[PDB]
Amino acid sequence: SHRKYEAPRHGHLGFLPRKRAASIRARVKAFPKDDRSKPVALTSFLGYKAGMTTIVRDLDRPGSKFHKREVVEAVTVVDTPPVVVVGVVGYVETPRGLRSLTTVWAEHLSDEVKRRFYKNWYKSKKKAFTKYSAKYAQDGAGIERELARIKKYASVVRVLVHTQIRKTPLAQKKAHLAEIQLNGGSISEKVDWAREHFEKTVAVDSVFEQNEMIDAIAVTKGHGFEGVTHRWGTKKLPRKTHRGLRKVACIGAWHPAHVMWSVARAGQRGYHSRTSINHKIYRVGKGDDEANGATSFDRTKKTITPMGGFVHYGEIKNDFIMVKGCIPGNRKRIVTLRKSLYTNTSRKALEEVSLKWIDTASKFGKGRFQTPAEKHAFMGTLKKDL
Amino acid sequence: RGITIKSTAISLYSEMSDEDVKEIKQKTDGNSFLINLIDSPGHVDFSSEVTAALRVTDGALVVVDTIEGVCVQTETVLRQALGERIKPVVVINKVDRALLELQVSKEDLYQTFARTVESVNVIVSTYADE
Amino acid sequence: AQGTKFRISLGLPVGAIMNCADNSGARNLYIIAVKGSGSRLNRLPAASLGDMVMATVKKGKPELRKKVMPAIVVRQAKSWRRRDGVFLYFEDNAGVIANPKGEMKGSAITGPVGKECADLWPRVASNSGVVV
Amino acid sequence: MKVEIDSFSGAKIYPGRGTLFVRGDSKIFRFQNSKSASLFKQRKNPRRIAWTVLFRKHHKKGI
RNA sequence: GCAGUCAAGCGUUCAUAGCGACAUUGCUUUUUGAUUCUUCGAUGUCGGCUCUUCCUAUCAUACCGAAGCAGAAUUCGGUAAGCGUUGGAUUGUUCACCCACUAAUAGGGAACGUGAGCUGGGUUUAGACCGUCGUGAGACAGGUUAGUUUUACCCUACUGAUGAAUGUUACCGCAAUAGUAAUUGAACUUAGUACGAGAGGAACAGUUCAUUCGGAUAAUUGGUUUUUGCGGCUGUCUGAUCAGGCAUUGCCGCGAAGCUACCAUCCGCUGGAUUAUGGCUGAACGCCUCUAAGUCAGAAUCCAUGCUAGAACGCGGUGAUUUC
RNA sequence: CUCUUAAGGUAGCCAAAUGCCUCGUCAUCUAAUUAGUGACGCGCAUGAAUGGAUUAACGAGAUUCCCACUGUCCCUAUCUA
RNA sequence: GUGAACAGCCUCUAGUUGAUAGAAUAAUGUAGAUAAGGGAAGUCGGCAAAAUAGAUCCGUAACUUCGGGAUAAGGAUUGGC
RNA sequence: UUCAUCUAGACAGCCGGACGGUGGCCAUGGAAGUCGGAAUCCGCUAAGGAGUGUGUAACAACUCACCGGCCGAAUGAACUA
Ligand SMILES: [Mg+2]
Ligand SMILES: [Mg+2]
Ligand SMILES: [Mg+2]
Ligand SMILES: [Mg+2]
Ligand SMILES: [Mg+2]
Ligand SMILES: [Mg+2]
Ligand SMILES: [Mg+2]
Ligand SMILES: [Mg+2]
Ligand SMILES: [Mg+2]
Ligand SMILES: [Mg+2]
Ligand SMILES: [Mg+2]
Ligand SMILES: [Mg+2]
Ligand SMILES: [Mg+2]
Ligand SMILES: [Mg+2]
Ligand SMILES: [Mg+2]
Ligand SMILES: [Mg+2]
Ligand SMILES: [Mg+2]
Ligand SMILES: [Mg+2]
Ligand SMILES: [Mg+2]
Ligand SMILES: [Mg+2]
Ligand SMILES: [Mg+2]
Ligand SMILES: [Mg+2]
Ligand SMILES: [Mg+2]
Ligand SMILES: [Mg+2]
Ligand SMILES: [Mg+2]
Ligand SMILES: [Mg+2]
Ligand SMILES: [Mg+2]
Ligand SMILES: [Mg+2]
Ligand SMILES: [Mg+2]
Ligand SMILES: [Mg+2]
Ligand SMILES: [Mg+2]
Ligand SMILES: [Mg+2]
Ligand SMILES: [Mg+2]
Ligand SMILES: [Mg+2]
Ligand SMILES: [Mg+2]
Ligand SMILES: [Mg+2]
Ligand SMILES: [Mg+2]
Ligand SMILES: [Mg+2]
Ligand SMILES: [Mg+2]
Ligand SMILES: [Mg+2]
Ligand SMILES: [Mg+2]
Ligand SMILES: [Mg+2]
Ligand SMILES: [Mg+2]
Ligand SMILES: [Mg+2]
Ligand SMILES: [Mg+2]
Ligand SMILES: [Mg+2]
Ligand SMILES: [Mg+2]
Ligand SMILES: [Mg+2]
Ligand SMILES: [Mg+2]
Ligand SMILES: [Mg+2]
Ligand SMILES: [Mg+2]
Ligand SMILES: [Mg+2]
Ligand SMILES: [Mg+2]
Ligand SMILES: [Mg+2]
Ligand SMILES: [Mg+2]
Ligand SMILES: [Mg+2]
Ligand SMILES: [Mg+2]
Ligand SMILES: [Mg+2]
Ligand SMILES: [Mg+2]
Ligand SMILES: [Mg+2]
Ligand SMILES: [Mg+2]
Ligand SMILES: [Mg+2]
Ligand SMILES: [Mg+2]
Ligand SMILES: [Mg+2]
Ligand SMILES: [Mg+2]
Ligand SMILES: [Mg+2]
Ligand SMILES: [Mg+2]
Ligand SMILES: [Mg+2]
Ligand SMILES: [Mg+2]
Ligand SMILES: [Mg+2]
Ligand SMILES: [Mg+2]
Ligand SMILES: [Mg+2]
Ligand SMILES: [Mg+2]
User: In a designed cystine with C13, which of A318, A322, C44, D34 is the match (CB 3.0 to 4.6 A)?
Assistant: First the structure.
């Protein structure tokens, strides 16, 4: 029979299967369209998600009811120590799609990167790339043939960067290595730029700037095996039903005599590659700068990191991106940050933003004090001492 | 609602410069004049408040929206005046409409005014007391 | 509806009774519908402060009972979060009987009124005491 | 961006943090956290609650 | 139940704007009959609940064509099922009816979808009351009240989860194929303007919000508390004190972390080809004609862009590959 | 006055757990009532120990409403064994 | 012991410490809990749950077979010293 | 398939004319070819209905049959399957 009352379907089917991502680094699938009339530059950037905090700022949005009035907004903080180029990869157009033609690497590589190639680093004989490096022997005999090979061919050039994991508070030691597409100009200045950067780091003011709308590509917080009530948003069933409420009642009609792909089932929730778009950059922080949490209106030297330190993360000692709102993934997870794939002119974009103030109260509790200074200035002296 | 419904009266006291009263081509004392005014309604449904005001007055100030021209009710309130033997004078009003809405040009405007006056005198000659 | 109104948490679904804050003669207001609400299977429509509801008077002068009228919610009693970061709430829910144009069948509102509700409704502002 | 002070504890209230309550009398109350708010609604007396600003003043502590 | 054909007539005037008699040709299988082919060593009956998908004879939303289309509003039709189609009072109801919001509250199918999915209000056992019937036992497609809703561990399907083999191992990627997504409204302003005698009274562009849906996220606010974390309280037991036990987590206040809420916050891309329809050039047919050749535009459509998985028998690049 | 059968439904009661028509009609209660209550009564097919009408108290009986209450619901989340 | 009490809760005498174990802490369950604002809108129906609860003092309606209805309703108070 | 027109100039297109008794008779509040009935004659003609439409309150004003100018070879109507 027909339905009885119409209601929208539960859950979006262009986000299927709801399985676990192949890896915890979400694949950055599309890069932006290359404009070759602009300097060789990176298009994405790796990151580590630290935590969130709160800001206030004036609002320039004429005709709103909060024009020139302060607003307060959540923000996520990505710890972005500069990343070090160690490779160049070049892809050719072919009638079956882009083909990687060759890879060429830097002459030496941090052991924190070479860790990426082992599952038992400690007990290895760490011989990875020992004999590749010898092609640099006299003048780079072999390697300069490859670089020419990329220049001759190669509709697209990608650079292999890797995170300086050791510069963060994680227990990891094993860096994250990723391709980043050079949107430079001329497939040649693109690959010169790569050679001119082997083992040379790239900071992130090079890549992004204040107010730049950017996308976040990461792997959703995993949650294990979920019932359909919470996993799909299904209606919890009436208190009286025998055999369970967190269920779908009619797994399907008699015909098609098959449970169909479109019906909510119990299974894995979270741990899904998500590409989430249009998060405005609110501040690009310098580690080689004091007073990261400072602002032209607050002006009381303090770092970004909050009292007690970011919960489950640690302290911010490096460059960081502070982006408006929230992003897929949890604290400590690798986070690719893409430049926007289109030129947004919404004017919600395009809006210059200036932080009045950046909360740095503790997140481990009902944090009352911005700085250990102002605690004391408020509390007084105490018995243990001072 | 922004529509006059009852026609209501007000008496205005106003002066005139010494050279202005010299032109007055009828016997005329002093320099201060007393204007007994009535603000009338346009709607046909209220025409009874026009004849009620035209019985108590001597001249009539007739207003014509410049862009709308002389309209059907302009025509019939005039037949109300000339029946009662009342002298008219005209204000072609609302011109800022012509510069903004119509982007009019000086000749475009003058000739607007001419045919409008031509239109009123047609009404005036047909019904004005021979 | 003289203005645009930013979203605020809903706290008065249908069936809710709120005090009638005006000297109209009504002691309360029983919400049966909320103007501007949309549709979802099984979802009770609900009002926040400033919203125009359709109500009846369960306690009050007979001349106002047995009859559906529009009301405007002026306090809300359910924590809501302004764009300046504050979660606030009143001690009670309350509204005033109005007419669709937004005018007020009352004559003077008693008790505080919320900022959002009074920006929306001038005729309501004209009779409000302490706002926000 | 005036910070405000907790009505019950005199604690400092940074933007976004805590709650604000409009009593019937139009008297505004600010609470920096949930605990301060809970106590006040239990009708507790801050002068008798040991950690509040206005209990150290009534006991001339730390001044 | 729905749709054509002829056109007397309605439409002041005028057959076909919108309608349409007398006739007559059809379609549909959510109606009810007619049959009795399957099932009586048994295919779980009504309705709701839940949830998915499909149909179009389209209620709304996109773009259009017609009008007895001035505006506003409405009607008729076209492409069109992309997307939505609701909250309640009485009833077991399907149906009905009314209140009320709404852009709209369209009709249907899937064993009159869906009972090892629920419920069990109705129907339809045995208990019992009434009314009419009956000599009686009893009967009623009359009323009424009580009345056990069983199994999955197997196969397949669906959801998620591993995995042999390919010389070994590790890293970075490609993209076949499959999936795909956003929705709709209001206020300001345009404007008391176009139009209109008046009464009334728009639209495109711009601004601010909002609804339904989606994916995440936890700074905040809120909820949860075995942090049995700190405090408080009763009873009893440890001779008192200190400090504890027991009271199935003894109870109360607060309670961080975690989990989480339109109860919380953030985010949801833009190129092309088309439909209908409007056109250009232009014959057929010395004219005309959007069409016959050729061609411009153009829709909530489709294809891509983007997003999701990645063929476990599709692929590339790359590293290191066992002294004894 | 009369016919069929002997009599011809009185006192009461009612769309009642008894009314087909029927969601009866009127009043009331609700924004809205096929529900409830009060009325009406040519009552398909009420009615006097096949007992009629009424009744305080009692009732794990059927039914309607109100106050309090609340995860029944909006609309779900969370903790324990 | 508490307490009106052979209630419940803790203890002395006496008896028992027996129910296959270990490690994990997904979904769905069964059993036990809590919940912002709203408060039956959920449902055939308030089913289930919640609210109430002892005792002292106060106050207590229609109706009634005068016996009741009654803990009606409804207020106040409660430790320690 | 049947019937028509055409080098004595058709069909099409364009272009000129489309008159005079006459506002023809009965009506009509008005009706001058053009709401409607009845009449359907004549004159002057290359031809022009007592009117094919549009129009008016009624005339006016355009329009068409009909005639002609132009061009120069074929073309028109009604049926069948
Ligand atoms: Mg439907
Ligand atoms: Mg059950
Ligand atoms: Mg925290
Ligand atoms: Mg105008
Ligand atoms: Mg429902
Ligand atoms: Mg909390
Ligand atoms: Mg049908
Ligand atoms: Mg016609
Ligand atoms: Mg028709
Ligand atoms: Mg059969
Ligand atoms: Mg048979
Ligand atoms: Mg079966
Ligand atoms: Mg169609
Ligand atoms: Mg149209
Ligand atoms: Mg017409
Ligand atoms: Mg669909
Ligand atoms: Mg319902
Ligand atoms: Mg069927
Ligand atoms: Mg069935
Ligand atoms: Mg089944
Ligand atoms: Mg069953
Ligand atoms: Mg039953
Ligand atoms: Mg029975
Ligand atoms: Mg009987
Ligand atoms: Mg008998
Ligand atoms: Mg019967
Ligand atoms: Mg029966
Ligand atoms: Mg499987
Ligand atoms: Mg595809
Ligand atoms: Mg007006
Ligand atoms: Mg617009
Ligand atoms: Mg969610
Ligand atoms: Mg918490
Ligand atoms: Mg103890
Ligand atoms: Mg214990
Ligand atoms: Mg093409
Ligand atoms: Mg996308
Ligand atoms: Mg594979
Ligand atoms: Mg007899
Ligand atoms: Mg009787
Ligand atoms: Mg009866
Ligand atoms: Mg009766
Ligand atoms: Mg019968
Ligand atoms: Mg009811
Ligand atoms: Mg009754
Ligand atoms: Mg009888
Ligand atoms: Mg009898
Ligand atoms: Mg007897
Ligand atoms: Mg008796
Ligand atoms: Mg008695
Ligand atoms: Mg004792
Ligand atoms: Mg005992
Ligand atoms: Mg005892
Ligand atoms: Mg024994
Ligand atoms: Mg459980
Ligand atoms: Mg349970
Ligand atoms: Mg609650
Ligand atoms: Mg509460
Ligand atoms: Mg309540
Ligand atoms: Mg109900
Ligand atoms: Mg029942
Ligand atoms: Mg119960
Ligand atoms: Mg009592
Ligand atoms: Mg005492
Ligand atoms: Mg010939
Ligand atoms: Mg000819
Ligand atoms: Mg010819
Ligand atoms: Mg005539
Ligand atoms: Mg005529
Ligand atoms: Mg004759
Ligand atoms: Mg003639
Ligand atoms: Mg003529
Ligand atoms: Mg001819």
Answer: C44
What residue type is assigned to position C42 of the chain? N
Q: How many distinct structural domains can be found in chain C? A: 1
Secondary structure percentages of chain D, helix, strand, coil, to 5: 25, 20, 55
Whether the link from the prior residue into A238 is cis, omega within 30° of 0, is no
Q: What are phi and psi of A344, to 5 degrees?
A: -75, 135
- Tell me, yes or no, if C41 comes closer than 8 A to chain A by beta carbon: yes
- Count the Cβ atoms, other than its own, within 10 Å of residue A8: 7
C48 HSE (CA, 13 A, CB side): 19
Q: How far is the CA of A307 from the C1' of H78 (A)?
A: 102
Position C130 in a domain: yes
Nearest C-alpha neighbor of C16 from the set C37, C45, C36:
C45
Interacting residues of C55 by C-beta distance below 8 A, sequence separation 6+: C29, C30, C31, C32, C68, C69, C70, C71, C95, C97
d(CA A291, CA A385): 28
Q: Is A344 exposed, middle or buried (0-12, 13-18, 19+ CB in 10 A)?
A: middle
Nearest alpha-carbon partner for A80 in A176, A178, A10, A168: A168
C-alpha distances in Å from residue A18, one per residue of A13, A271, B25: 9, 9, 98
Q: Measure the CA–CA gap between C109 and C120, rounded to whole angstroms.
A: 16
The reply to whether residue C87 touches residue D20, judged by beta carbons under 8 angstroms, is yes
C4: in domain: no
d(CA A284, CA A281): 7
Q: Find the domain containing C34 and state its range.
A: 11-132
Candidates C2, C42, C43, C84, partner chain A, best to mutate (most A CBs within 10 A): C84
Question: Tokens 């943090």 identify what position?
Answer: D17
Coil, helix or strand at residue D53: helix
Which residues neighbour C49 within 8 Å (Cβ) at sequence distance 6 or greater?
C8, C73, C74, C75, C76, C80, C114, C116, C117
Q: Are strands A273-285 and A320-324 parallel, antiparallel or unpaired?
A: antiparallel
Q: How far apart are CA B73 and CA B44, in angstroms?
A: 7
Distance CA(B80)–CA(B77), nearest Å, equals: 5
* Contact criterion met (CB below 8 Å) for A135 and A108: no
Cβ(B66)–Cβ(B120) below 8 Å: no
Cβ neighbours of A54 (radius 10 Å): 19
Ligand nearest to the CA of C89: 58
Calpha distance D32→D7 (Å, rounded) = 8
- D26 and C111 within 8 Å at the Cβ level: the answer is yes
Instruction: Give the CATH number of the domain where residue C101 resides.
Output: 2.40.150.20
- Best of D3, D9, D14 to disrupt the A interface by mutation (most A CBs within 10 Å)? D14
Query: Residue A256: is the preceding peptide bond cis (ω within 30°)?
Result: yes
Amino acid at A268: Q
The answer to whether D3 faces chain A, any CB pair under 8 Å, is: no
Distances (CA, A) of C124 to A213, C36, C50, C118: 41, 19, 10, 6
Q: What's the rounded Cα separation, in Å, for the pair B86 and B120?
A: 15
Q: Which domains does chain A show, CATH number per domain? A: 16-81+203-220+270-384 (2.40.30.10), 82-202 (3.30.1430.10)
CA distance A79 to C85: 26
